[PDB]
Symmetry: C3
Subunit: 277 residues, 3 copies
């Protein structure tokens, strides 16, 4: 049987930093000097509370704003609600999550589980346009009790005309072995719509990207249109039914793929070989 998420409800603490990078970009990190674009993955269980002690090490105001999770207005990360952070400053954001359940009126409250993201809200403009452009974005995953955990999680961010703020035609590339349970968090940012596509693999267009059984009528797809701040996620079995290979993923907007929005899902045999590579 596959590994599954346990019941949540833990209180968790975390240090996060905003850093200007030597190349001019901006990244979050869990450790000073180890910021990355995209930011590090934050993964919690429904019901967990997360207290992020955030330090802006930059010379400009910056913030943390999250999608999907519960937060009070004092943690929405906006200038308006006095929730950004001054240069050199520290603030504790609090993110909460909740489980689904029946309300008193008989309705069904949705849980927090899903594929989400965090990003800056005040660099460049009051909507973080400069922050996002420079790399201040990262993924968040909230797990429901009992759903399936992967062998590894990769984050693919279409940010304007870049993948993960990389130069055209520089990946990123990811590697797996035939049979691995691979998870993708797919996030879009900036100005343009895109269509995300994988060669040789497909997934369900629902909450987890996975069907639990035969009753789910969700479309099975390998192409999906996305816009700025959209986030979705899915799991695949690397090479399932198709074998080892250098499997392209790309934006399928023709000029975008032509201009470098391309990468490789490198699925290897156990000996490491990739047919045709």
């Amino acid at each position: 049987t596959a590994r599954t998420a346990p019941a949540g409800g833990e209180v968790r603490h975390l240090k996060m930093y905003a850093e200007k990078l030597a190349d001019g970009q901006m990244g979050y990190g869990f450790e000073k000097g180890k910021a990355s674009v995209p930011g590090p993955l934050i993964e919690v269980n429904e019901g967990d509370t997360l207290h992020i002690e955030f330090t802006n090490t930059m010379d400009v105001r910056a913030s943390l704003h999250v999608h999907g999770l519960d937060y009070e207005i004092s943690s929405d990360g906006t200038a308006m609600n006095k929730s950004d952070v001054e240069p050199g400053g520290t603030r504790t954001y609090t993110w909460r999550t909740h489980k689904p359940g029946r309300r008193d009126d008989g309705t069904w409250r949705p849980g927090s589980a899903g594929y989400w993201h965090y990003h800056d809200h005040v660099v460049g403009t009051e909507h973080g346009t400069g922050g996002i452009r420079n790399g201040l974005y990262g993924p968040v995953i909230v797990r429901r009790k009992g759903d399936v955990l992967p062998d590894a999680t990769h984050t693919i961010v279409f940010n304007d005309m870049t993948i993960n703020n990389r130069k055209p035609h520089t990946g990123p590339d990811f590697e797996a072995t035939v049979g691995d349970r691979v998870e993708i968090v797919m996030i879009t940012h900036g100005e343009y719509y895109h269509t995300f596509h994988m060669h040789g693999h497909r997934w369900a267009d629902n909450r987890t990207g996975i069907l639990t059984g035969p009753d789910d009528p969700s479309r099975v797809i390998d192409n999906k249109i996305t816009g700025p701040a959209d986030s979705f996620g899915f799991q695949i079995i690397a090479g399932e039914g198709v074998g080892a290979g250098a499997w392209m993923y790309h934006c399928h907007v023709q000029s975008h793929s032509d201009m470098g929005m391309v990468g490789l899902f490198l699925v290897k045999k156990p000996d490491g070989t990739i047919p045709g590579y």
Copy 2:
């Protein structure tokens, strides 16, 4: 228990007008001199029939065309099918709705229930490009027997680079009290794709925007990409799990929010106060 829609099947009558407004815009209304942009909400139950006695008070041809509901070709609102209205003229459009049910061949006929809209089809071009641009659009809601009625319904229309044809950074703003059941009808028009986003709230990407219980695998989202003539809708509990606050909604295409596609969901305590506002 929450209030729910009853069984439909009523025959309803309605007067509607198209008016040029003093500012140059065009609006529909239920009363002469009270046209609005967006047009007034039309809400019916599955099975109801609606007879709209429509008068074009403008000096140009205009029409009414609806999405989703049943109508005969004589009510499709097009110049081609001789279904528009001459300046000063009156025409009765008929919209019908039906319930779901089993067909003789064993298949399942879908019902009309959903979040829909009406708009002009002949002002400026044979596709109403001028009518829509000037404000001739409005929302339609069709309820299925037994689904949940809100405390209030707000209509948010992304029309080209405007929200409800308003100037940049002029809202609209909406108000609620922590705990209200708030319904959003979200409609897109014009030339551009958008992504609709709410701070502090989320909904289900299905027909009603709501989960009935734990078996629904629909993604829970707070960001959604939309294109011209898309309509969807949802309900939220104002401030549920997040409290009172000035909660922004906006298009999340960065330049669009920077250029004014922003508004506030003002969720108040009972004393009317909004923390940080």
Copy 3:
């Protein structure tokens, strides 16, 4: 009762050609001299294997690449994986499909069933930008055991600013009789997002476009946003609840419909008449 797909598992063989057309376009066909834009429909049952003996009759390199179905890397149709075809050359692509089922780890493997497409991957650019632009695309349908077969299937491809590579305002138009079970395969290609819309009809936004019964919470729609390489499909009962008529379909992006992305769903009485036509 309606006709339904049987269990699959047949091994099928097929000849396909790439041809330059006299007008300058490029089309696939099952017979030399009978290429079409879009390419011919390939329809199989889940579990079938398809061996396509493909001949490039053009003076440039070309390929076949499919979405959604199972294929080994040697059939992905890319220059990178040495899977394109030289001018005048022949290659056998193999497409496989599989049924859903329970994995050993308890998870649910999705089946291949869906609305898919094939297109060129090497004409003009390493992403087939020229091939797709010139007309090298076609639809694929994979049926699950037991789902509903239509009276006829039409393919509507939004390719850049054209429908099926046709000149503005030249259709295509399709015809039916009130009561026909009409299937639409809707595919998008090129550079631009679109919104596909039908007058007088609607469908479910799920895998088959159809609801099986009352438990499916999928949104019922008549407008849908699409991007390059998106494919979906649905069935409707021609004129159901609305009668005979010249029912427009179009992209609902206003300038796109104004510029000719329009066609007619001609639904006739048995005597062939169309009210208002």
